[PDB]
Design a protein around this ligand. Sequence first.
Ligand SMILES: [Mn+2]
Ligand SMILES: [Mn+2]
Ligand SMILES: [Mn+2]
Ligand SMILES: [Mn+2]
Lengths: 203, 217, 217, 216
Amino acid sequence: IEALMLFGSAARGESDVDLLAVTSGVKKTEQTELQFLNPEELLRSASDGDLFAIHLAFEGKIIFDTTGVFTRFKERLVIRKDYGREIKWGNDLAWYLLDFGMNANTTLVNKRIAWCVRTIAIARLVESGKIIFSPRALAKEFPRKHVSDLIGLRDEDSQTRKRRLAGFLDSIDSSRPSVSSEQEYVSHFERTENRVGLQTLHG
Amino acid sequence: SIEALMLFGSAARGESDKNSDVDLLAVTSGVRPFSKKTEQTELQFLNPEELLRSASDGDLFAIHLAFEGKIIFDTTGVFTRFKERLVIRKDYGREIKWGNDLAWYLLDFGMNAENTTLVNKRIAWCVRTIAIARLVESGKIIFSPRALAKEFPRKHVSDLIGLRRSDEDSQTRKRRLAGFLDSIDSSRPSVSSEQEYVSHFERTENRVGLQTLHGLK
Amino acid sequence: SIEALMLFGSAARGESDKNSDVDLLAVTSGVRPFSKKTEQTELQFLNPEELLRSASDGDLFAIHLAFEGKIIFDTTGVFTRFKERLVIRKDYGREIKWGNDLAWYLLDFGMNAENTTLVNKRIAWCVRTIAIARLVESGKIIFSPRALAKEFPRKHVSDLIGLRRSDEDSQTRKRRLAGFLDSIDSSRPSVSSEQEYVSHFERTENRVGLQTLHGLK
Amino acid sequence: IEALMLFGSAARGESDKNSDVDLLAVTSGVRPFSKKTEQTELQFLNPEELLRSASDGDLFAIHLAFEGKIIFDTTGVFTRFKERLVIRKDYGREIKWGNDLAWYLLDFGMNAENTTLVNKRIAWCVRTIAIARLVESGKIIFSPRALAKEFPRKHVSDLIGLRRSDEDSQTRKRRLAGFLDSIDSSRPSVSSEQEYVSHFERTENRVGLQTLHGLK
DNA sequence: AAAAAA
DNA sequence: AAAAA
DNA sequence: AAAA
Ligand SMILES: [Mn+2]
Ligand SMILES: [Mn+2]
Ligand SMILES: [Mn+2]
Ligand SMILES: [Mn+2]
């Protein structure tokens, strides 16, 4: 392991502990998340302006770095002109979770609703020039309908939170994709290369 | 009374030269901005309100702190509030014009000043400010001298940034700065005399330009 | 939930070689001690009461944490309270005896055990515990394998500590361990059989000896 | 500057009001000196002197080793520092230096012009005695609050609290005398200020000599 | 339920 | 040019 | 301040 970084909530001072380990030749406990990446993928995330890379660059705390990979990481970062692609992936998966998700692995569904909401909020705020990633600040700076409730779903309890997701979607004037069955969603996620929407759908 | 402390600059990046400074930012309430400098250390003091305001303004220096600063300690979370307040702008034309106008002043009146070290520091300030701003406008967050010269390859960028901690009084500095200004298609502001420059820096609120002149007297 | 996190071991020292692990200590309320391992990481959990007890008891591991550990975060000040409780002892004869007794067990009955990796790890533990304790007794705070071999230069110390990263059942380990034990003038405990060793470890409160017996199943 | 370390209260997470941020900068070719401001204190040392403080088991080096936070270290000097550290078996020399200076301050310093320096060095005497005796017992205590808890002699907290004070109260002398009595300190066999000076010279009490110099 | 890392 | 802790 |  050539470099180690603290990120997430523990890096902001406020509760999961998230650690990024960079290693060439490559997860979770009740309390910890240890994520591994090789240097090529770390730098690619910077070059492609991944929202996750923006978080690491502006909020990650370097524990050690023997090779200087985190400084090459930062000098490769290009914040993209727009994150419409990412916003659309979050919107589309949200509609799928609304239409066919409220009765699946309920743990994953709630985690994924929160992912949709956070992704849309992070992307719109990054577009406007912000570097906000914590749930608390996202809800303050992107005060759409039920944002606090939905981000808090990242929670294995199932109620009638279908109404909350629908309200959120209306307040950002989201349009459902032109799909009917769940099988239409599969081909839509495949066609739009919605990796998370695909990984989610089978789970 | 100092509620937070941050390492920034080359030492925060791990890329220190023989004659490189160690840059430290101390956040302490109830003071105006000032810096304590020794042989190899620069200690900058700022109060929290000024720090958060600089973030809200999208100051290029605030971006550097957010992107590269290493928090040594923070007892109040002020650096988290600082990052929440940051707004990276799309248009740094104001800061670019400030660096342009001061560069022209240094070209016209700086090359034979008594305080050679200040002129060189501020030539490099003009070039770095313009380079940093143009790259931020393109979605890049670049601050090291090496990457600035690579990513903003205008005429004499590397050797002019190299003047930042120099007492060189070479008469070639004029040609190099005029070459840089031509390569970015700079226009001299509608000014002639040194007093006219003062009013211009007053009128256009060029804080660093004003202080550079006061320093040179 | 984790109230504090600390880097320790080789990475905290800045001397991690090819086959190094990253060692992390998470201080977690309301858990008993346990660890989470990958090929390149070790994550140790302790609750605050147990962390402070190890300091009060002068555990050699606690000395390592206080002397070389790097605090990543500490929301409760538990590491400050830990260091205030530390009492470095003058006499580590108990621990030295625990290391000697377990080394004889492993020499006599460990060399063809199924769990070759655990045997090798615990041979290195015996040698390291003896070496660290003797050096602490002399006023030195030494934990790195390189410095332990230098400051406690007994037979095969470097080779045997290097077994902590080995799954190999080489025949050379028995001779080397015997050479080390001879070089410190060690003697077998009065234990007439392998089966009598669990009773001996029980009566002498050799926790690592008992745990090693448990894991060798 | 090849290495930089935070120490003192800020390294323990306790930097508050009226407390100073303490930084240690390692750089070549520099006699020990310190730059000080309202809220910071920047001590410079060369590598040879830093490692000597470890080899000699200086009480201050023990603080750096067990409580210092490394900000950066490009040469590994702090690792060679820690591997040189030898905690002495006895700190009687340091205890006597603090006792002797405390008596000098009691006898001749309680009315000096430089009240601030007297108060600072009273606290140094008390802190040095407390730290030294706790280190001899196997502890690594340096914060004022923990020193008063773990070395609970008479007035320890009041006297360490003089370290940032310009108080000239008459109570200081009686509190210092009480502290010295509670550790059964014996005053040096001197009868004059001139003889204190000769005593500090003979016993090589560098802080007692620097204090005397600074008071005049 | 679970260290024994250094 | 320490004496901080 | 104007450090980056
Ligand atoms: Mn979070
Ligand atoms: Mn720089
Ligand atoms: Mn090791
Ligand atoms: Mn203190």
